[PDB]
Structure formats: structure tokens, C-alpha cells
């Protein structure tokens, strides 16, 4: 209970420190190119896309999703925690170029990452270096792709949207993990 | 986008209708007993437990996590939705009897289900009747078990907590889906 309290405090303080530094909102994400192919009822959509100027906004709203899950295990405390965003979606903004045959338009897009959650684990020996032991951005359960000037009924939208989501689940999630993990680790492990 | 706003609104209306239902909050969960075995190390824990008077609270705070994820595919509008709880946890209370050796205490516990979320899918033909084509209570990302009278440092805590968490992931999730899924289906399908 006192231990739960102080772990909660370590986490909140680390969150505050990270939010304070800026660095994290907006967060830059490296460009990413990908190739797509889908057959959709007598129609074929095969081509290529490029995302540039990708920025994640909203992590300034990060907050603990509740008490730490804590168990004393043989003279070492083990804690597991959720940090999500609170007062927003996490918003991804970027320029999109794609190619389909002779068409190669560009537009801008906002992608909504719903229920962004970081799961992290800690360890505390009776003395006494708090060690962060795992850090992961959970799988995005729902991503909404607002592709500038593209109607959602346009058969190509569904193709582009599904590809962008897969890219977010794979490429972008792992990049966000690579940025967030050392930041929390330096704050916690002090 | 109007189609999205329409789908959002149907979801918002169904949530409101379901939130007033009763049997939703508090929701009863059938009694459950489990014979468990956990290996921690050197020590080894075989035993049994029984949960009774299980009640889930907080579902009256259900709310969409953002826009419906919407796209047209082959003349069908397809929508994917995330519904969580806003300004609350989902909290489970219950009586707990457990047995380890002829240790056989009884107590009461509060379990915190963090980031409780339901994901659902809809299809909307212009033909055409709206069907809910999927519904899932997502894996709980973190559960905090507050077991009356029992210290987080007590070696028996970690064991019961882990067993209770597995029961939540399996039995409790299934039981909540049993209540929620046909309630949403009924609302959304007329």
C-alpha cells in the first residue's frame, strides 16, 4: 500500500518530467514507404505509398491508468503499470504520396490512434535500484485514417486505410517504443 | 464526415439505452471456483478458491474511444468501434474463500480492471439491414487485486492475485461478453 503509493509517485513524477522536457509532443517519426496490393470485387489496386513529415501529437496527456499491480516476490517487489492518454486520442499527422498506375497524387492525413497504452514493468529489490524491466506500446485496437480529400466510399480508401493501419501497428508502434522506453527508463532508474 | 457521425450517433444512442438497462451496472457474475497450482520457486502452491456475490461496477460510464473506423467495401459500409469507460475503472467486488493446506480463510476483495474496452464491428448495406458482425471484450491489460486482510508482500498474495487475474481473463471476460454482446446486438440491429 505504501509501496503502491510510492511506485505510483515514481511513475507520475517520471511522466511529469517527460512531459516537461517537451521532446515527446510533438514526436517526430521517420519517413516510411510501403507497397500495397489488393483485389476488391473485379477491381485491382496495386501500388506504392510514402509517408513524410510524420508527427505524433497528444502524448502530453499521458497519465497512469490506475494503481500499480504489485506483488512482493521473495524479497523483491514486482510492479506492472499502464500509462495511457487522457483528454485525447494520440494524433498522427503526415503527408501522403501514393502511386496507382499513372496516378500519383499527394495529400495530407490525420490518423487517430485510439486508447494508446504503454505497459511497463518495474523491479525493486529490498535495496534498491528501481529497475524498469519491460516497456511496450500495446497493440492499437482502432486506428482511424482521415485521408485528405478521399471519400471513405471510394474503393481505394479502404485499401489505403488498411495499409496505413498495418504500418502504424508495426513500424510506427515500434518506433514510438524506441523513443519512449529510454525516456521513462532514465527517469525511473534515476 | 456524415456517415461516420451517423455511426457514432447510433453507437452513442445504444450505449445510453444499454446503460439504463440494469443487470449492466452493477452486473452480476456467476459464482466461480478454481483448483489452482502455481510454482513460484522452491515453494509450490496447490489449493482451491471460490468467488461468490461477484458484482461488476462502472459500465454506466461506457463511452466511445473516438470515431468509428469506417470504409466502404463492395457496396457495404463497414465500421469498427472501440468503447471503453470514461472517468471510472471497471471494479469487481466479491467474497473470496480459499484453501491451501488446512489454511482456509475467507475475505472480501476489490479487483480493478484497468482500461476496460469493448471492440465491435458493424456492416451496413444500402440494401439492407445493419448487422453487428463482431463483438469482443478485449484482454484486460492490467488487473489490480485488493484482497482483504492480505499483504502484497505476503507470498500467498502473489499466487492468489495471479490466479484471480487468469480467472478474470478467462471466465469473467466470457461472462461479461455474455451480457454485453446480445445487448448491443439488439440495440444496433433495430
Author numbering:
A (entry chain B), B (entry chain A): 6 to 195
What does the paper say about this structure?
For decades, the house dust mite has been known as a major causative agent of various allergic diseases including asthma, atopic dermatitis (AD) and allergic rhinitis. The homologous allergen, Der f 7, isolated from D. farinae, is a 196-residue protein with 86% identity to Der p 7.
In this isoform of Der f 7, residue 130 is a Pro instead of a Ser, as reported in other Der f 7 sequences; the other residues are identical. The model of Der f 7 was refined up to a resolution of 2.0Å with R-factor of 0.224 (Rfree  = 0.28). In the crystal structure of Der f 7, the 11 β-strands are arranged to form an elongated, curved anti-parallel β-sheet that wraps around the long C-terminal helix, α2; this is compared with the 10 β-strands in Der p 7. The N-terminal helix, α1, interacts closely with the 4-stranded β-sheet and the C-terminal end of the helix α2 to form a hydrophobic channel, likely for ligand binding. The ExPASy predicted isoelectric points of Der f 7 and Der p 7 as 4.90 and 4.85, respectively. The putative IgE epitope residue of Der f 7 and Der p 7, Asp159, is located at the start of helix α2 and in proximity of the β1–β2 loop. In Der f 7, Asp159 is located closely to the β1–β2 loop with a distance of only 7.7Å between Asp159 OD1 and Phe50 CZ.
